Amino acid sequence: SGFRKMAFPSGKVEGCMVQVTCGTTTLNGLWLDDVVYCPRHVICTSEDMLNPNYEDLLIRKSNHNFLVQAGNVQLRVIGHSMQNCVLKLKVDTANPKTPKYKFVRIQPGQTFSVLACYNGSPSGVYQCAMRPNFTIKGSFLNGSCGSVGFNIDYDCVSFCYMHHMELPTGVHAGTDLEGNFYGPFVDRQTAQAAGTDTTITVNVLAWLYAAVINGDRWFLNRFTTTLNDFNLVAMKYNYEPLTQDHVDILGPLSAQTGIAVLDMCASLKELLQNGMNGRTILGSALLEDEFTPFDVVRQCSGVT
Amino acid sequence: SGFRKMAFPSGKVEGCMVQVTCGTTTLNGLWLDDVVYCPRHVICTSEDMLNPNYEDLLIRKSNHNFLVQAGNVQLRVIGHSMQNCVLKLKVDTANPKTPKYKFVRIQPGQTFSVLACYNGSPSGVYQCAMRPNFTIKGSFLNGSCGSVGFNIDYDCVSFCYMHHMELPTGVHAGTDLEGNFYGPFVDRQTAQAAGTDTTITVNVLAWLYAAVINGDRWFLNRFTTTLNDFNLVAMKYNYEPLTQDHVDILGPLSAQTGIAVLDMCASLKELLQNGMNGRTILGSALLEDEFTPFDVVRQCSGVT
């Protein structure tokens, strides 16, 4: 029993993390087979950051401009090319520790593990959700660009996020591993800011199921609601609409607890309308929306 | 910026995790050099669990009774011995991936990362605190015994916890890597239960400093207090006493924020007496006590 924000074991990703230096700019890259993936703004100088022409900047560079370190071992760059906001650096050595992997773009509301890295050396691992406004509430400092987010399934690492920058509210923005940004952000210096966010309803419900499995039942009630009148309450409290597919995904959790989704929706409606009235759920006094139905099943027993 | 419950990268520990089978009982062990460390109750049958004589049970066993699997590779047991509640199984193969390591016992109030494991295969990683009552609020299912907790410092892994069992309130108990239990618990079936717990005051204060560094200042005030009158309030709200050494450890954080510890204590006293009045700190509506002063410094910038 118990419930924690649990990351995937990070070893398969640690053995892919390298340092990339171009000029005085230093940051992290991801080394898979004979390619190092890193944020393209490693080739930028601070002046270039207003409106750089990344294609020009790259033509003016050569292989020996790029310094790639895997621990202490130098890796020699034998090629360079750019895909969207990612630079691809081909190196002389294929990574012997390359895991089975995929580049997958994730959806708002889904979770992933983050390996915070500095100077190519991993620092910490933690769990994140892609917010509905395509930011992540991460934990990142200067030099973390190039750190990646990922999920692991049957020893295959699905990379979904590469870190690029921090927005003024302190939330974080980045790209998938094809270099395409999540959300309406650009890798240059503007006044860009996160749009308005919403709460991930299906995840709050999954979390309530987790609590029932772990013995929190005080928020439960005998009422049931319609999917339409629940959604109508959701709009008032800035919660994402709940779909029939969401109801279907919660199916396994409702089956294990014996509480049908729509009954659980009645509980959520009461918790939004009346607050938590001095009680806590799974050690939190706020409704938690960063656990997917999948995360709950993976961590909770199949019993109770 | 940002603040998350961040674990250490788990790779160095993943490469030490093995499966140990004795009879029908299967659980995890830790493979360092040519020794596999695992909970001694792997030799138990369900009957033996009332009051086993572990020394007798072990004499009646032989090396070929022990099945140790490192992934797919069999490891042959060439010796067995017992230290307190841990069994030490000497195997034919020294672990090539053994990291630099130490066995250290931690103090109540300190944190560590946990690598949840099942059948020798790592499942997840998360951060825990040793509670003042020597339990941990972990996330563990049947088959997690043998999973370890650890900290990493300059590539050296300090193992501090091996998981053994779950207590009736759903909290978790285990030993250090010398097999000595944390807290007044035994590896047998009794009515044992966690004693009463308290909140880790120095960690709450560290966390408030983290929030100030991340821009939460609403809880601040102009008042200062004496260490004696703060401690006197702490007793009323079931908070651990604050020592002058605690004040000294918070020094770096007070220096970076410019808020002296005792002023911060005045803030904590107000937050205990008046609640949080509908506001949140670092995304929590409760005072968080599972970040040490060290954890805050490691994750927060040195600026602001």
Ligand SMILES: *[C@@](O)(C(=O)NCc1ccccn1)[C@@H](Cc1ccccc1)NC(=O)[C@H]1CC(F)(F)CN1C(=O)C1CCC(F)(F)CC1
């Ligand atoms: C890198 O972009 C990075 O660490 N980004 C993530 C981040 C930064 C701050 C807080 C949380 N996450 C490095 C790359 C770099 C550039 C120059 C010298 C060394 C490293 N960027 C930074 O550390 C900061 C500081 C800076 F150098 F002034 C520039 N910077 C940025 O984050 C910029 C934001 C906008 C951009 F287009 F993404 C380019 C980088």
Ligand SMILES: *[C@@](O)(C(=O)NCc1ccccn1)[C@@H](Cc1ccccc1)NC(=O)[C@H]1CC(F)(F)CN1C(=O)C1CCC(F)(F)CC1
């Ligand atoms: C192991 O002890 C374990 O997983 N402990 C941690 C745990 C259990 C439940 C919830 C959270 N954490 C395995 C060892 C085992 C024993 C027999 C068969 C297979 C594996 N123990 C268990 O999975 C559970 C179920 C059990 F098998 F009935 C016995 N058990 C225990 O946890 C016992 C608690 C008291 C003890 F002295 F520690 C012995 C194990």
Ligand SMILES: [Cl-]
């Ligand atoms: Cl690819």
Ligand SMILES: [Cl-]
């Ligand atoms: Cl499960």
Ligand SMILES: [Cl-]
């Ligand atoms: Cl040792």
Ligand SMILES: [Cl-]
């Ligand atoms: Cl730091």
